[PDB]
Design a protein around this ligand. Structure first.
Ligand SMILES: CCOC(=O)Cc1nc(-c2ccc(S(=O)(=O)NCCC(F)(F)F)cc2)cs1
Ligand SMILES: CCOC(=O)Cc1nc(-c2ccc(S(=O)(=O)NCCC(F)(F)F)cc2)cs1
Lengths: 187, 187
């Protein structure tokens, strides 16, 4: 019944904003009453927070899998691809979750916590490439990592939402990989 | 009295969100009654739209000034600096204007129109560098320009807002210039 509420919310977010989805719709979709809804979640906003938490954690576990186990361009492409495929498979939760950063402190804090982790891991790998002599000591690794991660956040999510302007979804992986590799390996 | 309403709104946006500013506050600050306010603007949202329009147009005119008139790194740094200084001098209008993109179609359309223009100008200069043989033919110019402009949007505004995470404001110009120059000139 928890999973039924989450699946219903993800289904309805594909068709309309969270503001245009009510607890009755989630309750109905999940085959339960409204007071029964309130047993699993305090609000429709808590439903989105759980969906976002699951997508973020799936991306994070996929990146951990790569980290524990090719040329440098392919290494970066495989890592960026974790976020392209994971968020790209959950576009409605991505879109609604990003919009909720403005109005929900728990969604802002969830997004902020994982961004810090992904930036720290990006910088650790750039520093390892510098240590082994494959990357030059240009910018501070952590500052370069921050700007590249913020680029990917804005550019992936604009592509997925079909924003004007955006890189077409079929060109965004190649675009971001070029900018990562040239900025990490370039003097 | 129009300029008094705009100056009052920019002053109060430095201390609190647009939601926590009422027409009475703008009216009072500007030395006029509330019905007199409604003669100049239909809403506090129209006040923000005008402030944003002025900041965007000041950036756009500053970039036109450069365009009509040094090494390649300095050329890019001077252009990025137009946005760093212009938006950096109007942080409260930047922050509130970006937040209003979610709730106001005219603010979203204003932002979208100028982003398209700045991306088209970025691509035209990359193509000119390619034509003269200074930049290699890597990514499609317009796709590279889009991702670099979206990076700058996200990274500048995160820095100005002191977001977690963000590049410190005193490091963000150098950070963005490195990524622009390596990605435009790098193979
Ligand atoms: C030996 C293993 O090394 C690797 O796999 C290569 C690596 N890739 C990453 C990495 C981190 C963040 C992004 S990201 O910038 O796309 N996500 C945040 C933004 C988003 F969440 F919104 F996408 C993309 C790639 C770190 S290390
Ligand atoms: C011969 C003259 O050539 C030049 O001056 C070098 C040039 N710079 C630009 C340029 C365009 C957009 C940004 S930007 O990406 O920072 N703004 C959008 C995002 C923002 F609005 F949010 F900042 C930064 C630089 C285009 S051509």
């Amino acid at each position: 019944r928890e999973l039924a509420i989450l699946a219903t919310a993800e289904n309805l977010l594909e068709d309309r904003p969270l503001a245009d989805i009510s607890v009755d719709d989630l309750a109905k979709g999940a085959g339960i009453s409204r007071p029964t809804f309130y047993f699993y979640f305090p609000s429709k906003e808590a439903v989105l927070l759980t969906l976002l938490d699951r997508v973020v954690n799936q991306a994070d576990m996929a990146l951990q899998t790569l980290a524990e186990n090719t040329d440098r361009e392919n290494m970066w492409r495989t890592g960026i691809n974790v976020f392209f495929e994971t968020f790209g498979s959950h576009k409605a939760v991505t879109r609604a979750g990003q919009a909720a950063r403005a109005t929900s402190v728990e969604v802002a804090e969830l997004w902020s916590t994982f961004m810090q982790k992904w930036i720290a891991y990006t910088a650790a790998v750039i520093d390892a490439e510098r240590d082994r002599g494959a990357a030059p000591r240009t910018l501070p690794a952590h500052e370069l990592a921050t700007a590249l991660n913020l680029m990917n956040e804005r550019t992936l999510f604009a592509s997925f939402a079909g924003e004007q302007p955006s890189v077409p979804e079929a060109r965004v992986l190649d675009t971001l990989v070029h900018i990562w590799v040239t900025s990490i390996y370039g003097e």
